[PDB]
Each structure stands twice: as structure tokens, then as C-alpha cells.
């Protein structure tokens, strides 16, 4: 059809068809797979907490917030030898001080982040 851009979902990638007319009496077709990138709806934060057997009710609560760094249609710019981040999933602290926790043993030093109410 006369539509400038027609997107065809896959029957492994979405097929996007755009019509370009260099002249009035000539035109052609371009076909490009776009991204087909699906984000994990959940991140195995069991590199976050050991998932204890019992967890009490807490006034604080954490949520996995799905973010999109670039807006719908906003261009993305990438400098040489530097990649582009497109999601940047974040965790929201909703319900708070914070201070270091350092355990030492015979000179062996390691610090921790303590976020409590």
C-alpha cells in the first residue's frame, strides 16, 4: 500500500517494510529485522539475597522496575569503543539511613552496605 512504513510480525524477527521513492515514478522495498530483544521479566536476585526460609512483614519493600533509557523514537548515539545501554533495569526502595558494615579477621578487611529503617 501507499503507507510509508509497514511492519510485519514474524511468522524469527519482526519484518519492517519501508517504501522509499527516489523519484515520483520509481520506488523500491527495504526489509530489515529490527531487534526482537525480550527482557527477562525477572532477574535472579539470588545473587542479591539467599532467599531465606522465613521472611517477616516489612514496611520497606523492593520492586523490580523495568526502565527504557531511550524514548519511543528518540535516537541513540554511540561513541567508538563504547556500547549503548537500552534498558537499565532498576530496583526501587519504597515503604532510610545507610552506613557501612566492615567485618575484619586478622587484618582481612571487607565492607558491606546496610540499608535499614
Amino acid at each position: 500500500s501507499r503507507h510509508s512504513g509497514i511492519l510485519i510480525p514474524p511468522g524469527k524477527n519482526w519484518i519492517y517494510v519501508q517504501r522509499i521513492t527516489p523519484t515520483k515514478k520509481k520506488f523500491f522495498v527495504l526489509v530489515r529485522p529490527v531487534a526482537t530483544y525480550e527482557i527477562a521479566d525477572s532477574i535472579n536476585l539470588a545473587t542479591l539475597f539467599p532467599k531465606d526460609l522465613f521472611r517477616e512483614k516489612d514496611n520497606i519493600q523492593l520492586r523490580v522496575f523495568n526502565y527504557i533509557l531511550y524514548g519511543n523514537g528518540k535516537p541513540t548515539r554511540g561513541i567508538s569503543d563504547t556500547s549503548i545501554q537500552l534498558v537499565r533495569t532498576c530496583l526501587v526502595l519504597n515503604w532510610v539511613r545507610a552506613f557501612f558494615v566492615e567485618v575484619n579477621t586478622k587484618g582481612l578487611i571487607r565492607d558491606f552496605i546496610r540499608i535499614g529503617l
Binding site: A35, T36, Y37, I39
Partner: peptide
């Protein structure tokens, strides 16, 4: 639960530049 990303190398150039590639 789905996002797309078309790769398009967009360049912005001054009117005084020289273009080595035809349209």
C-alpha cells in the same frame, strides 16, 4: 514486554561540508 531498535547511522553535517557519496 517487547522493544525494538532499528540500526540507522544518522549523521548531521554543515552545509559547507563535502559529500563523497551520492544520494
Amino acid at each position: 514486554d517487547r522493544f525494538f531498535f532499528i540500526p540507522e547511522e544518522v549523521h548531521i553535517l554543515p552545509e559547507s561540508s563535502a559529500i563523497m557519496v551520492e544520494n
